[PDB]
């Protein structure tokens, strides 16, 4: 049995794979939604960090 | 109740006292492009009154020795008004039409004109006459504009197809002893929801005398035919510089 705290609070033997993503159904191409004009600050979706 | 009509669209108005009726083409009125039929994602501009209005092209003379004339749509409005600027400034185009043809004569005049709408009126040629040359029509015959073009062999419509079966498309008659106007309402007809107005013409408009004009010496010998047409439910998409052809 495990007594010391570094062994009880250990992530050794975690066999479960931790995935960030999940596969969702995409039977069709994504639909386009209606958009209007945007004239604000802060929200700038064209600028990226590649 | 049926011989009188007023057609109002935009800043324009036509009266007629000697009409037959209005032909609504293939039982479909013009409409706008649905989101299911659409594929392009840009927002189209829908200018209601500046392009959907009656435009008057020119005036052909019905003589004794006439053979017929054709006009190609939308080529007739690609240099005219606000329609022919939105169509040049954009890449895509969708519209119906209301065509309205005018020919006035007296009660002592006789004659008949077949006024018909032929979709995808592809223009063939005499092939050298012998059929050996694979000749082709020039640009000033397939897209002749508002001036229209005079049929060489109207029996085959310059396409090898008989005039006699042309009532299977839209049509009216202008029988001078019955009517002087011919009104056809055409929807957008294409395999695609939009298309180019400068490259592709959706349909043609034939005006052919089946029965020849006759009058006795003393009557007005100048019997003009005037084409007057209105876009309907117009739509333009894909904006860039203005190109004419």
Distance CA B80, CA B75 (A): 10
Cα of B242 vs its chain's centroid, Å:
24
Experimental determination technique: cryo-EM
The 10 Å Cβ neighbour count of residue B14 is 18
Coil, helix or strand at residue B57 = strand
Residue from B90, B58, B93, B97 nearest B186 by CA: B97
Angle at B30 between CA B228 and CA B21, to 5 degrees: 55
Q: How many Å is the Cα radius of gyration of chain A? A: 23
Q: In angstroms, how far is the first alpha carbon of chain A from the final one?
A: 49
Give residues with Cβ within 8 angstroms of B114, minimum separation 6: B163, B166, B167, B171, B173, B206, B207, B208, B209, B210
Q: B101 and B182 in contact (C-beta within 8 Å)?
A: yes
Structural domains in chain B plus CATH codes:
1-245 (2.60.120.20)
Pull the structure tokens for residue A7. Answer: 């062994």
Rounded to 5 degrees, what are φ and ψ at B238? 95, 90
Give the end-to-end CA distance of chain B in Å, rounded to a whole number.
Answer: 45
Instruction: Give resolution in angstroms.
Output: 2.9
| CA B193 – CA B205 distance, rounded (Å) | 21
Q: Which residues contact B69 (CB under 8 A, 6 or more apart)?
A: B60, B148, B149, B150, B151, B206, B207, B208, B225
Distance CA B70, CA B203 (A): 10
């Amino acid at each position: 049995g495990d007594r010391v705290a570094d062994v009880i609070e250990s992530s050794i033997g975690d066999s479960v794979s931790r995935a960030l993503t999940q596969a969702l159904p995409a039977p069709t191409g994504q639909n386009t939604q209606v958009s209007s004009h945007r004239l604000d600050t802060g929200e700038v979706p064209a600028l990226q960090a590649a | 109740s049926d011989r009188v009509a007023q057609l109002t669209i935009g800043n324009s108005t036509i009266t007629t006292q000697e009409a037959a009726n209005i032909i609504v083409g293939y039982g479909e009125w013009p409409s706008y492009c649905s989101d299911d039929d659409a594929t392009a994602v840009d927002k189209p501009t829908r200018p209601d009154v500046s392009v959907n209005r009656f435009y008057t092209l020119d005036t052909k003379l019905w003589e004794k020795s006439s053979k017929g004339w054709y006009w190609k749509f939308p080529d007739v409005l690609t240099e005219t008004g606000v329609f022919g600027q939105n169509a040049q400034f954009h890449y895509l185009y969708r519209s119906g039409f209301c065509i309205h043809v005018q020919c006035n004569a007296s009660k002592f005049h006789q004659g008949a004109l077949l006024v018909a709408i032929l979709p995808e009126y592809v223009i063939g040629t005499v092939a050298g006459g012998t059929g050996t040359e694979d000749s082709h029509p020039p640009y000033k015959q397939t897209q002749p504009g508002a001036d229209g073009f005079e049929l060489q062999h109207p029996y085959v419509l310059d396409a090898g197809i008989p005039i006699s079966q042309l009532t299977v498309c839209h049509h009216q008659r202008i029988n001078l002893r019955t009517n002087n106007c011919a009104t056809i309402i055409v929807p957008y007809m294409n395999t695609l929801p939009f298309d180019s107005a400068l490259n592709h013409c959706n349909f043609g408009l034939l005006v052919v005398p089946i029965s020849p004009l006759d009058f006795d010496q003393g009557a007005t010998p100048v019997i003009p035919i005037t084409i007057t047409l209105a876009p309907m439910c117009s739509e333009f998409a894909g904006l860039r510089q203005a190109v004419t052809q």
